[PDB]
Amino acid sequence: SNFLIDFLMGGVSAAVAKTAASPIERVKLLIQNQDEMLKQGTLDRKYAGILDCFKRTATQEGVISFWRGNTANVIRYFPTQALNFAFKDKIKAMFGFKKEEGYAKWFAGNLASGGAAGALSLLFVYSLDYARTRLAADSARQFNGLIDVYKKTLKSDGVAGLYRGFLPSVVGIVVYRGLYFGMYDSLKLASFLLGWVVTTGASTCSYPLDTVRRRMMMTSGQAVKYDGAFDCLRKIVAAEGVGSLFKGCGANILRGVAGAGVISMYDQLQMILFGKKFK
Ligand SMILES: C=C1[C@@H]2CC[C@H]3[C@]4(C)C[C@H](O[C@@H]5O[C@H](CO)[C@@H](OS(=O)(=O)O)[C@H](OS(=O)(=O)O)[C@H]5OC(=O)CC(C)C)CC(C(=O)O)(C(=O)O)[C@H]4CC[C@]3(C2)[C@H]1O
Ligand SMILES: OC[C@H]1O[C@H](O[C@H]2[C@H](O)[C@@H](O)[C@H](OCCCCCC3CCCCC3)O[C@@H]2CO)[C@H](O)[C@@H](O)[C@@H]1O
């Protein structure tokens, strides 16, 4: 039952990190998809910034509201790690490389590997991300829970509603991984600084894809939908300008530092309270 303990405790760790990150995560998602909310009459007025969003959301909805949708984040660990344990090792065997065999080969193989594993994961898991996203962007709240989101979205758009924005998310995974490993190699506390700068750059450069993905998610249950990722992109840029793609980026970076800090702290607390850390 050792594997069970490692599994569940790892899930507790991930749950801690995601729960801590949750409040600033929602602010990012609100600022990012506020035009969609305006379209769906879920928002009364465009936000002025991060502080505005925090203040308004708090005073109007409450404090607990900041952890809305986080349950999806918590229960996401188990199917992902089940898939992670099952196939990630075997997939790496198919595409992986030691740097000595070739840097180009290592890079490309790493891209293909991470992309394929990520896609395989999303094939089972993407719906949870959809639910999280739809629950984050609210306020009579449009949705009343995970199950409500699923049932209603299935009732309106069927299965495709749950998997909307899949391709820009995959492309996003590939791009993000490429930037991450590239920057990681280029420049290699010191560890905290490196991790923060790398993560920040990689996530920032790959952000518009994420925005497209999430706003495509938002169109589920609506009469008007984007005709693919490129169509979405084109319409967003035409209507609101290029900067609109980067809406909520800074809040996401704040989620970054927050998450890194919390996960390091909790790792320390794990070494204190338990013999070994479960990550
Ligand atoms: C278009 C985008 C933007 C760029 C790509 C992704 C991630 C950043 C992509 C990121 O993708 C992660 O990248 C990591 C660094 O390479 C990689 O770690 S590593 O392989 O050990 O090196 C993770 O692989 S895993 O096996 O450990 O789990 C991988 O997560 C996945 O592939 C699982 C999928 C279910 C996502 C995961 C994730 C994260 O913020 O971390 C997450 O799902 O939480 C995404 C957020 C959403 C976007 C943002 C997606 O909307
Ligand atoms: O806040 C007002 C508007 O913000 C966004 O529009 C941005 C666009 O997204 C954005 O692409 C556009 O850019 C124009 C400014 C160009 C910046 C020049 C850079 C030079 C280098 C240093 C940084 C700035 O500015 C618009 C504002 O006039 C939103 O997309 C709009 O919906 C919103 O009405």
Tell me the CA–centroid distance for residue 21 and ligand 2, in Å. Answer: 28
Q: Where are the domains of the chain?
A: 1-279
Instruction: Report how far residue 50's alpha carbon sits from residue 28's, in angstroms, rounded to the nearest whole number.
Output: 8
Q: How far is CA 141 from each of CA 43, 65, 259, rounded to the nearest angstrom?
A: 11, 11, 28
Tell me the CA–centroid distance for residue 250 and ligand 2, in Å. Answer: 15
Measured over the CA atoms of residue 28, residue 193, residue 170 and residue 207, the dihedral's sign is positive
Q: Does ligand 1 come within 6 angstroms of the Cβ of 70?
A: no
Q: How many Cβ atoms from other residues are within 10 Å of residue 268's Cβ?
A: 11
Instruction: Report how far residue 255's alpha carbon sits from residue 193's, in angstroms, rounded to the nearest whole number.
Output: 15
Element (H, E) at 79: helix 77-95
* Inter-residue contact 86 to 57 (CB < 8 Å): no
Please give the structure tokens belonging to residue 202. Answer: 């990689």
Instruction: Report how far residue 110's alpha carbon sits from residue 106's, in angstroms, rounded to the nearest whole number.
Output: 6
Q: 3-class SS at 242?
A: helix
Instruction: Report how far residue 205's alpha carbon sits from residue 234's, in angstroms, rounded to the nearest whole number.
Output: 18
Residues in the chain, how many?
279
* Inter-residue contact 80 to 121 (CB < 8 Å): yes
Tell me the CA–centroid distance for residue 244 and ligand 2, in Å. Answer: 8
Q: How was this structure determined?
A: X-ray
In CATH terms, the fold of domain 1-279 is Mitochondrial carrier fold (1.50.40)
* Inter-residue contact 29 to 136 (CB < 8 Å): yes
Q: Does ligand 2 come within 6 angstroms of the Cβ of 264?
A: no
Q: Does ligand 2 come within 6 angstroms of the Cβ of 243?
A: yes
Task: Using the atom order of ligand 2, give the atom closest to the CA of residue 246.
Answer: 9
Q: How far is CA 58 from each of CA 73, 159, 202, 255, rounded to the nearest angstrom?
A: 21, 34, 31, 18
Instruction: Report how far residue 144's alpha carbon sits from residue 276's, in angstroms, rounded to the nearest whole number.
Output: 39
* Inter-residue contact 169 to 126 (CB < 8 Å): yes
SS3 content of the chain, % helix, strand, coil (to 5): 80, 0, 20
Task: Using the atom order of ligand 2, give the atom closest to the CA of residue 245.
Answer: 9
Instruction: Report how far residue 210's alpha carbon sits from residue 167's, in angstroms, rounded to the nearest whole number.
Output: 11
Q: Does ligand 1 come within 6 angstroms of the Cβ of 212?
A: no
Chain centroid to CA 10: how far?
Answer: 19
Please give the structure tokens belonging to residue 91. Answer: 């997939």
